[PDB]
Amino acid sequence: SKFLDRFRYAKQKGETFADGHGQLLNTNRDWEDGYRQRWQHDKIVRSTHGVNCTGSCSWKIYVKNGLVTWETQQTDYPRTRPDLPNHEPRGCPRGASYSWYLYS
Amino acid sequence: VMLREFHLDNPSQYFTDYVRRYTDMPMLVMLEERDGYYAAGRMLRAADLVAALGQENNPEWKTVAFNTNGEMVAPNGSIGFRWGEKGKWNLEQRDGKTGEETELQLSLLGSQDEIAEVGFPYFGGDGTEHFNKVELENVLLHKLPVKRLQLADGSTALVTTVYDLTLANYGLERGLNDVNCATSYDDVKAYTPAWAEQITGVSRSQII
Amino acid sequence: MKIRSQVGMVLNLDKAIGCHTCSVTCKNVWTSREGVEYAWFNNVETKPGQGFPTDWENQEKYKGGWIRKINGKLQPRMGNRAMLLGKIFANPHLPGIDDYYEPFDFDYQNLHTAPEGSKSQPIARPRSLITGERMAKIEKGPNWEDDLGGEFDKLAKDKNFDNIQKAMYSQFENTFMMYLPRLCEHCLNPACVATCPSGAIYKREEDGIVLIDQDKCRGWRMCITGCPYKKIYFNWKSGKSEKCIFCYPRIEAGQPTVCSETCVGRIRYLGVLLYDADAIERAASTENEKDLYQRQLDVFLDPNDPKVIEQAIKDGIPLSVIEAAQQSPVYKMAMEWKLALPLHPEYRTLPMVWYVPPLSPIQSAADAGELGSNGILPDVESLRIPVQYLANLLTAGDTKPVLRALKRMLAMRHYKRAETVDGKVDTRALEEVGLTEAQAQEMYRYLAIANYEDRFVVPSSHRELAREAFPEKNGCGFTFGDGCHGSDTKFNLFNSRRIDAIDVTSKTE
Amino acid sequence: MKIRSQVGMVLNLDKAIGCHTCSVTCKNVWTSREGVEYAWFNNVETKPGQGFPTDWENQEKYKGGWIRKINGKLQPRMGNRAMLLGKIFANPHLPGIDDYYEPFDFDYQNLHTAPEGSKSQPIARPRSLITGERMAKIEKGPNWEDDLGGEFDKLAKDKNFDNIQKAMYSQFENTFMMYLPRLCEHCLNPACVATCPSGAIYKREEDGIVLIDQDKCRGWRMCITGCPYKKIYFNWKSGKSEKCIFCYPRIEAGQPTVCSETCVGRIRYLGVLLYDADAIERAASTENEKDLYQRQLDVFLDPNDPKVIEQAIKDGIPLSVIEAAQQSPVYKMAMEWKLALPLHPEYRTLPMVWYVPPLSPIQSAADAGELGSNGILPDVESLRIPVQYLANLLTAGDTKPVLRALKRMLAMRHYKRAETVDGKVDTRALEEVGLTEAQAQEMYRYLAIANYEDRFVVPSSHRELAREAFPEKNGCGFTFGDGCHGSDTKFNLFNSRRIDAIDVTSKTE
Amino acid sequence: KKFSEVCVGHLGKETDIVTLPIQHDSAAELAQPLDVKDWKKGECDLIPGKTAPHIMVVERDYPATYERFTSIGPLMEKIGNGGKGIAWNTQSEMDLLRKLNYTKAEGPAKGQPMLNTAIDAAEMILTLAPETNGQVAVKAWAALSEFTGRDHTHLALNKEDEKIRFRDIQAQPRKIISSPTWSGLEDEHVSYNAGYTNVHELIPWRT
Amino acid sequence: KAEGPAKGQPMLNTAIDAAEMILTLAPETNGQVAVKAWAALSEFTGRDHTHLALNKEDEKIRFRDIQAQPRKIISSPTWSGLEDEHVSYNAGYTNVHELIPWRT
Ligand code: SF4
Ligand code: SF4
Ligand code: SF4
Ligand code: SF4
Ligand code: SF4
Ligand code: F3S
Ligand code: F3S
Ligand code: F3S
Ligand code: F3S
């Protein structure tokens, strides 16, 4: 019970730090699952953009709840010589917004 | 069964050529004198012959065989050609001395100087009480076609091929009237379907 | 002495291309909900400019950050505890929606459903996402000033132009612009945490990520004013505040944040920094604000020092975290090469997202110029971006550390050119800035080649420690609604039990 | 005539290797929670055997499935509505935990914590996951009979040995065993749905997957008895029942189920089947149970028939689903080649997970045998597994359809051997079984080569249809607890609003 | 690392006498051709490498154990690499490895490629092996060709530019290259079958 | 095709079938074709250019493989630069180093 937890008030207090400027607490953090479950997805699919930009960037298409939700760049291109920087992640702001179209 | 039907009675062109070029069957084995019979000794080496078959490098590590023309030769590929020299460690059917193409002969039957009895070890009669055994003789004497050769040290010796030794070991009758060879698959001899049925319990007809 | 760890971030503004890819990916993942559609956890601003929200750097106006009282004690600029509570019925400094922008959408469907016989070509007009009403015109956006969009006199109101004769910069030939991408600084002495009456904001012990507890937040909306970087955004629908979460779901397993991995310019670096939590208040309360930068560096600890390593282990820092700290690109840039600098250290929050200042085209001159100390390449004195502007942004007005960073970058360039073009060893520039060939080569490795494994060195947050990962692995995610999550006491009115826990106790000990 | 679609499944028992990989992957993903640790949504059984739960095929004992009354009307074997309700205080046919097995774990920690000076080597003993008490011995498990584990007289109690003189099979030389992997059949006329007093179980319209609503289920535990395949497992902790969910989260986007994609033997095929929902009752109530198999085939519709296609579109079937139905490996095996057969059609549920019967080594004989119609390969009459056993399992005792399937498989083998060994065309075997060269080559393509794209032809469940995918894409997953999910009426006592919805209505229409 | 510091004062630069049995796939395999002679029975002289094991001298730098463990030694460049009776030059591979793994800045192994991480070690394996580096594959088949007198480089020339990398296999498993270390082919027209090269390339079995 | 006007010809039913046609026929994606292409060019110039693709003659890029990881293409006479691991692609490189004329 979250209500009953309030009674463990002072009991959840750990050591203070920085000469009393701070307090370490030992309290529940389960609420953090809220953002974790948003990031979680069904799968990622490799795709790119059929637009005339010259980018030719490979992306990870995220499917969640059986729908396309967002995309982030693939970074697994075959690496260039050791004396050259690699291509990853490529991408651009336009491409990062493509997912918007599907159900817009 | 395979040797009897696909190598002897109805020779397979594919199988015959294969064992001729890819096995040590045509290779010559020296026979050792025993009391009343012979035993298969070490393989004949180029070094054992007078001119060492023209082999200067590792002659004691190169095996010998007869070509289809009755001539003795040291074919390419033997371990002796691997070190101390180059270009001859291959399976090309060639004469290791003349570098000329040659054809190895498998059996000496039909060109032997005489027939000699060679003893073969047989353990099928031994074993614990938990397994079936077939009593024959600890040593099985087989009739093998041989040829007498004059060695480099002046001595003489009888030789036969791995091929002939193998057919005898399997118990294949070849016309020399060998009592220890099978007269049929039902003949309980050292290595038949009838024999195996007793040892393994597997029906001879299935084995066949 | 209490050692704690955190994955800090460094953004190389010299490589910044102001593309906003970082902003779009964050938005798609974290803030596409009604209530936070106007909120950009990560936002990029073109400077000179006033930013998002407008004039966020003006603390006299917004009251963010800390002040050091005459007695030497720290107090939120917003006011002490009583002063702050006295403002709770109506936060007098609160930024309004118009300080950000009124979120909008367009009537695209009109393009599809326009009736036959229309007198003119149908069009999609703007509509407010706040009222749902037609908008006569869009007058503002989160990136309205992009690429010097607006009259100079307007952009130049930029707080960072303080103490600078800016007239000369209104001249075409002297034009300059740079990009400032930013997110929450996940400070060591966060002003937000200190200004929340409910105590819903906290810094995570294991990785230093600062979060607003969505259960515990009561919507007092005071924290928004408290943050001098204005990186906390009120969710107008839920009635609670939200902020950059440093992508903790990813960081927890050793992955880069979304804005870091998706940074197209490859300017973001992630690396562990070990800090002495017991020194936070001492550092943040130093008398001279120009000393805050160095005071913070002094709170960072040497990860290769056995004394620190042994203390770290004693204080609970995982071995893999200590290891990551020993190959941290952030530590190298901030502590070793002195290329990275904090963003507005004078706010006294001890920010953990630092920046390498940008180089720029040489300034306008009488002629084509002459070869300088760096040959055909620029000398720090010739750069067109006024160093004082950069100092106001990163070092509380002290140009010394900014000049050092810029000069060192140029020195590396001089050294590498001698090597790759002349095929000769020339360390003249490096010696002038106190760099060794080895340091210049490592700088080059990380800044130029910048392999993926070198840009991000993120260790696991080790969720198995001090918790029960086994039952969690087996039952997390089955969101049927057991009503038992979020509390340590097992009793619950609905007479239920946690789905991801074991209720049948072992009787065999 | 009301057309609906469903992704059916076919398991080729001839390729089954009884490895249980399918069971482990399902378990790890879906049932590793306390309460369902003993439940195996997918479980593999070695036959002859009684299975999991023990003797599940004995409907006289467990009362599963439907019966056809004298008046021709269907009624759950469990009883009509009133009869069933009269059993609600204590389900008299309910399988007990011991009918499955008492779930156990081991005291591994004793191996780690055993005290110094122990008299003997420490060991990890079993403990019950139900009571937490030490177990003197493990006496049962979900796969206890694996590979003929147990005396023949015990295994032979197998319901499928009915009407068979089984004595001869107790002889070593006549030994035989096969594997039967199984999951929920996601029936067209599910007995579970019909036997749930709360109406919490339903078949999804768009893809035919049968689910138990975890909100609405009240734990009446009658459905467990109703299912003749005993594929519904009570969650002893939550107090509600659960069952194979056909991995709908994956199917919804066009992916194979976990047990299908992880099937090591590559024996599982997934393909759409279009069926006439209006004919379900007529088919399931046919007088002779040996007619149920064909009656069900008659409910399946030809996906290449324009009449069916146009009706499908009119009934709302997505174009991509119709397309998938036209290249369905399941349709080919069940309808065209007649290789796949239902599992226990006599239960009258119209199951949707079918099986191709297995071939087996030739039976014991007097000699090595002679060349038969198929040369050195087996003739159907020589197979060691009694065809009547397979008929009891798949065709209500009718050996005709089983013999056809087996003979056709052997015919394909004969035809292919002539082709690949003799380099000749020999269709003698195919003609004898009514197969064309083209059919044999396609059978070979799907059964032998079995490329991934040919084994699984799963279309999307199209979650965007009749719903609002846009707001969902933007806000799904933020599980903060808005308390507004799961209801159509907007009013809620906690005065909240859905996180993934739009509350501000457009005023521009 | 701990051993290297703890051994100081106890073990330094030592000289070790190591016995080594006669190895198959080495010229020494041609030890006793016609019979068995036991030197301890006076049936022959004790000849290391022929009638007895090879007696080798190995120098060990115990304090440098860690530095050697974490670096690719100089023998690859000084002596080379090989196996199954053949050897080849692997200088180009070591040069590549210096760029991929970086090099020791100082100490006993200064200048040698690094072996700090498991990935550095994996890259060493991939770069040096003929199965994973077409360049090495061709040099390997070329070495074998000297013995047989038949060209075998045609077995890897069509993949000479192939170089399998650790990060690439993380993206997708990669099929290896035909190598003389084995006797079958990694080909797109014929599956791998042992003894295939002996039968079709006429390479002898090592008997 | 089983029957009809195109009986016996490879199929082009799906986009993947079409993609495989492209990959299999092009010298950039099929080393076998690459060598035959460079050989054709060699007739005109009188200089061997097959050495530019022989080391990749067995390479065959497939649609499903690129879904697993983007693949670098093969040096082709269709272009004037090299796809090499020691030198980056630079236009006009083959004209300058292989002595192939510009089509002027
Ligand atoms: S991310 Fe941008 S540049 Fe890359 S392919 Fe997409 S639209 Fe083109
Ligand atoms: S930048 Fe982040 S941690 Fe620092 S005061 Fe603002 S919201 Fe708090
Ligand atoms: S760290 Fe994550 S939440 Fe924060 S700005 Fe970057 S992408 Fe957004
Ligand atoms: S097999 Fe599945 S759908 Fe059919 S009755 Fe049982 S639980 Fe219901
Ligand atoms: S379909 Fe999914 S839930 Fe059903 S048995 Fe297979 S893996 Fe388990
Ligand atoms: S002041 Fe605190 S109560 Fe919420 S709105 Fe800010 S975190
Ligand atoms: S603006 Fe572009 S350069 Fe990186 S910091 Fe943002 S993605
Ligand atoms: S009978 Fe119905 S109420 Fe639940 S336990 Fe079964 S689904
Ligand atoms: S038993 Fe094995 S063969 Fe497939 S059906 Fe299950 S993974």
Swiss-Prot record, chains C, D:
Organism placement in taxonomy: Bacteria, Pseudomonadati, Pseudomonadota, Gammaproteobacteria, Enterobacterales
SUPFAM superfamilies (UniProt xref): 4Fe-4S ferredoxins (SSF54862)
Known function: The nitrate reductase enzyme complex allows E.coli to use nitrate as an electron acceptor during anaerobic growth. The beta chain is an electron transfer unit containing four cysteine clusters involved in the formation of iron-sulfur centers. Electrons are transferred from the gamma chain to the molybdenum cofactor of the alpha subunit.
Organism name: Escherichia coli (strain K12)
Descriptive protein name: Respiratory nitrate reductase 1 beta chain
Its membrane topology: Peripheral membrane protein
UniProt entry keywords in alphabetical sequence: 3Fe-4S, 4Fe-4S, Cell membrane, Electron transport, Iron, Iron-sulfur, Membrane, Metal-binding, Nitrate assimilation, Oxidoreductase, Repeat, Transport
Major localization class: membrane
Catalytic activity entry: nitrate + a quinol = a quinone + nitrite + H2O
Cofactor binding remark: Binds 3 [4Fe-4S] clusters per subunit. Binds 1 [3Fe-4S] cluster per subunit.
Cellular compartments annotated: Cell membrane
Alphabetical GO biological process terms: anaerobic electron transport chain; anaerobic respiration; nitrate assimilation; nitrate metabolic process
GO cellular component: membrane; NarGHI complex
Binding site for [3Fe-4S] cluster: C196, C217, C223
CC cofactor: [4Fe-4S] cluster; [3Fe-4S] cluster
PROSITE patterns: 4FE4S_FER_2 (PS51379)
Subunit structure: Dimer of heterotrimers each composed of an alpha, a beta and a gamma chain. Alpha and beta are catalytic chains; gamma chains are involved in binding the enzyme complex to the cytoplasmic membrane.
Domain 4Fe-4S ferredoxin-type: 7-35, 175-206, 208-237
Induction or repression: By nitrate.
Positions contributing to [4Fe-4S] cluster 1 binding: A16, C19, C22, C263
Residues that hold [4Fe-4S] cluster 2 according to the record: C26, C244, C247, C259
UniProtKB/Swiss-Prot annotation, chain E:
Coiled coil: none
Induction: By nitrate.
Comment text on domains: Apoenzyme contains at least 2 NarJ-binding sites, one interfering with membrane anchoring and another being involved in molybdenum insertion. The first binding-site is a short peptide sequence near the N-terminus that contains a twin-arginine homologous motif.
Similarity annotation: Belongs to the prokaryotic molybdopterin-containing oxidoreductase family.
Subunit structure: Dimer of heterotrimers each composed of an alpha, a beta and a gamma chain. Alpha and beta are catalytic chains; gamma chains are involved in binding the enzyme complex to the cytoplasmic membrane. Interacts with the NarJ chaperone.
Function: The nitrate reductase enzyme complex allows E.coli to use nitrate as an electron acceptor during anaerobic growth. The alpha chain is the actual site of nitrate reduction.
Protein's recorded name: Respiratory nitrate reductase 1 alpha chain
Protein species of origin: Escherichia coli (strain K12)
